[PDB]
Amino acid sequence: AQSIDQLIKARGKVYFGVATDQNRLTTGKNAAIIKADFGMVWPEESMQWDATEPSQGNFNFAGADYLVNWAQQNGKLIGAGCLVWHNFLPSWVSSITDKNTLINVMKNHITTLMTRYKGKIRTWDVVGEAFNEDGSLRQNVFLNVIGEDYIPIAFQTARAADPNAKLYIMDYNLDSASYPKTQAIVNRVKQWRAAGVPIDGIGSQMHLSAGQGAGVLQALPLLASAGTPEVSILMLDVAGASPTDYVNVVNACLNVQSCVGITVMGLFDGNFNPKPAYNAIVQNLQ
């Protein structure tokens, strides 16, 4: 009966969120569930580079506009992204080898997307999956052609394009304080923020095997130690939809003042009926 997003707001957090897209909002009972239980929606695909700028200069916003308008009309916060990362990246971008050209292309992409939705977007994932597992920077086209300054540039461009949005760097496999990747992103966000880079948040996307949720009790505090005003959580997957892993992640967020909420990607079975993880989360937040 009770809404998870309502319950998490009552514990002082901002949102319980879900990642969806136009195709699912128009099918059956998807819109109703989202209205009842979630306070934020994110486009799963409609805002990625190969969706929005499949050919340079030729932007496609049909699906993203649909999601944004639906969320606005139904009072849902909007997260969007990812602006800069190696996935969903057309080959016309990764074939570029000229530094100033790539700088201009990356700025045009950031500025066109954020300007279109200026003032409407709570969180922009500006840079995604920038780190290797060993803590070194991922050798995507931006790093190779621009260098490591592409991460500052991308964040300064976004801040200028829409100063109202919270700007996030996001990555996966940050679920343990013992991982080199978790420590490296903290150290580097610290350095970037000291040099004035407007990284408002770190988003931890979690591919959880059974038992890895406990790790977040110690990793989320470590991530919050980079000093961003916000951190957040995305549940990409949980092995066996294990209730205990879900509850530990929720409790990690409740323990970290700067954690604003949790998003799940797509807790419900094929007939849109709550699963045990659902009930466990509600009972924990109750």
Least distance between Ca ion and beta carbon 216 (Å): 11
Q: Which is nearer to Ca ion, 52 or 205 (CB)?
A: 205
Least distance between Ca ion and beta carbon 227 (Å): 26
* Residue 217 falls in which region: left (phi positive, over 0), alpha (psi -120 to 50) or beta: alpha
Q: DSSP state, 9?
A: H
Question: Which residues sit opposite 262 in a β-bridge?
Answer: 16, 233
Enumerate residues 6+ apart whose C-beta is below 8 A from 172. Answer: 129, 204, 205, 206, 207, 236
Residues near Ca ion (CB under 5 A) are 207, 209
Nearest residue by C-beta to Ca ion?
207
Least distance between Ca ion and beta carbon 207 (Å): 4
Q: Which is nearer to Ca ion, 238 or 260 (CB)?
A: 238
Q: Which is nearer to Ca ion, 71 or 264 (CB)?
A: 264
Least distance between Ca ion and beta carbon 175 (Å): 6
Amino acid in the structure at residue 236: L
Closest CA to 264 of 49, 39, 86: 39
Question: Which residues sit opposite 205 in a β-bridge?
Answer: 172, 234
Q: Which is nearer to Ca ion, 121 or 219 (CB)?
A: 219
Enumerate residues 6+ apart whose C-beta is below 8 A from 136. Answer: 184
Written as six digits, the tokens of 83 are 């602006």
Least distance between Ca ion and beta carbon 40 (Å): 24
Q: Which is nearer to Ca ion, 196 or 211 (CB)?
A: 211
